[PDB]
Write a protein that holds these residues in place. Structure first.
Motif, mmCIF file in Angstrom:
data_model
loop_
_atom_site.group_PDB
_atom_site.id
_atom_site.type_symbol
_atom_site.label_atom_id
_atom_site.label_comp_id
_atom_site.label_asym_id
_atom_site.label_seq_id
_atom_site.Cartn_x
_atom_site.Cartn_y
_atom_site.Cartn_z
ATOM 1 N N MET A 7 0.850 -1.223 0.000
ATOM 2 C CA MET A 7 0.000 0.000 0.000
ATOM 3 C C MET A 7 0.868 1.249 0.000
ATOM 4 S SD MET A 7 -3.288 -0.916 2.380
ATOM 5 C CE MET A 7 -2.456 -0.419 3.885
ATOM 6 N N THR A 8 1.377 1.607 -1.174
ATOM 7 C CA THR A 8 2.263 2.752 -1.297
ATOM 8 C C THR A 8 1.499 4.056 -1.094
ATOM 9 O OG1 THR A 8 1.928 2.844 -3.687
ATOM 10 C CG2 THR A 8 3.764 1.517 -2.878
ATOM 11 N N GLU A 38 6.119 35.940 -1.526
ATOM 12 C CA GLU A 38 5.766 37.326 -1.805
ATOM 13 C C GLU A 38 5.039 37.406 -3.140
ATOM 14 O OE1 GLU A 38 9.254 39.773 -1.531
ATOM 15 O OE2 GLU A 38 9.418 39.422 0.629
ATOM 16 N N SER A 48 1.854 6.521 -3.186
ATOM 17 C CA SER A 48 1.517 7.030 -4.512
ATOM 18 C C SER A 48 0.091 6.673 -4.908
ATOM 19 C CB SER A 48 2.503 6.490 -5.545
ATOM 20 O OG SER A 48 2.268 5.120 -5.808
ATOM 21 N N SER A 49 -0.460 5.598 -4.343
ATOM 22 C CA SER A 49 -1.856 5.264 -4.600
ATOM 23 C C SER A 49 -2.786 6.348 -4.073
ATOM 24 C CB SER A 49 -2.192 3.918 -3.967
ATOM 25 O OG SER A 49 -2.151 4.006 -2.556
ATOM 26 N N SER A 57 -1.863 9.483 -3.497
ATOM 27 C CA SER A 57 -1.375 10.818 -3.824
ATOM 28 C C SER A 57 -2.409 11.628 -4.594
ATOM 29 C CB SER A 57 -0.083 10.716 -4.631
ATOM 30 O OG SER A 57 -0.324 10.121 -5.892
ATOM 31 N N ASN A 58 -3.211 10.974 -5.435
ATOM 32 C CA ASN A 58 -4.203 11.702 -6.220
ATOM 33 C C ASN A 58 -5.308 12.274 -5.344
ATOM 34 O OD1 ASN A 58 -3.293 8.992 -7.713
ATOM 35 N ND2 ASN A 58 -3.378 10.646 -9.228
#
Lengths: 49, 43, 125, 49
Positions: B1-2, B21, B4-5, B7-8
């Motif tokens: 279960m990384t 600034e 990256s799965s 991440s979306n």
């Protein structure tokens, strides 16, 4: 001293300068000479490491 | 279960904005020392 | 050590193994792209692409030779448990057709109703 | 100093100068080098904005 307006300051970070001229002796008919620093040359040394 | 799965699915992940600034420079009035100001509405 | 007061010599103590080797890094070509947790054959290495690669980025392929749940099979074929399972790079789908395809694993659980299979990933022969 | 009678003043508003020579290590068969500033070249930086 000042030279043509250029002010050359004293050189720092020279703790000690030693002038090792050679040493020579005439043992009999053969002369043995420990050559010193050649005139017109010199060496900077990092000391005793 | 990384990771990256997941991440979306940004709604789950913490959002931290890269603070920086932004904007635009204020415009100064430079002419005034040169100019003598006369003001009359009926010019 | 630079400017150290004396000369010194360095002797290399060799060792071969550098990493456990369960996963490898590959760089994606023009037509190649990856979604995370999907099977791709990139630069001759077949494995589970662990991150979204798109193109030009470096993507990890995970080749631990474990058991994997994939579906994504050519549904016309029946995947009986134990059959050798190949990778069709042209179709980007698993298949038991072999022929010129790359061998990638062996099926443990057969084609269920949802076309889901479990298979053991074979080494990168 | 006063080169040719031209008093060049000291450079100011350079609060700090850092000398980043590179770094290298030979790990196994491969040499990994972190390149430092090239000799001669230098970088003037606005800090931490």
């Amino acid at each position: 001293h000042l030279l043509n307006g250029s002010m050359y300051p004293s050189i720092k970070n020279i703790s000690t300068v030693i002038y090792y001229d050679g040493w020579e002796v005439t043992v009999g008919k053969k002369t043995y000479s420990y050559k010193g620093v050649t005139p017109g040359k010199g060496y900077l040394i990092r000391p005793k490491r | 279960m990384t990771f990256s799965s997941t991440s979306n699915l940004k709604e789950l992940l913490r959002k931290v904005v890269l603070d920086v600034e932004l904007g635009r420079e204020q415009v100064q009035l430079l002419y005034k020392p040169i100019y003598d100001s006369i003001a009359d509405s009926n010019l | 050590f630079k400017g150290q007061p004396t000369p010194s010599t360095i002797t290399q103590i060799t060792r071969a193994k550098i990493s456990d080797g369960k996963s490898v890094r590959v760089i994606l070509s023009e037509g190649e792209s990856t979604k995370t947790q999907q099977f791709y054959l990139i630069n001759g290495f077949f494995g589970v692409a662990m991150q979204d690669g798109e193109k030009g980025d470096e993507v990890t392929l995970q080749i631990e030779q474990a058991e994997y749940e994939t579906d994504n099979i050519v549904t016309s074929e029946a995947f009986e448990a134990g059959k050798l399972i190949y990778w069709d790079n042209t179709a980007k789908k698993f298949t038991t057709t072999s022929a010129s395809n790359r061998l990638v694993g062996r099926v443990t659980d057969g084609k269920d109703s949802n076309n889901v299979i479990w298979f053991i990933l074979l080494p990168q022969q």
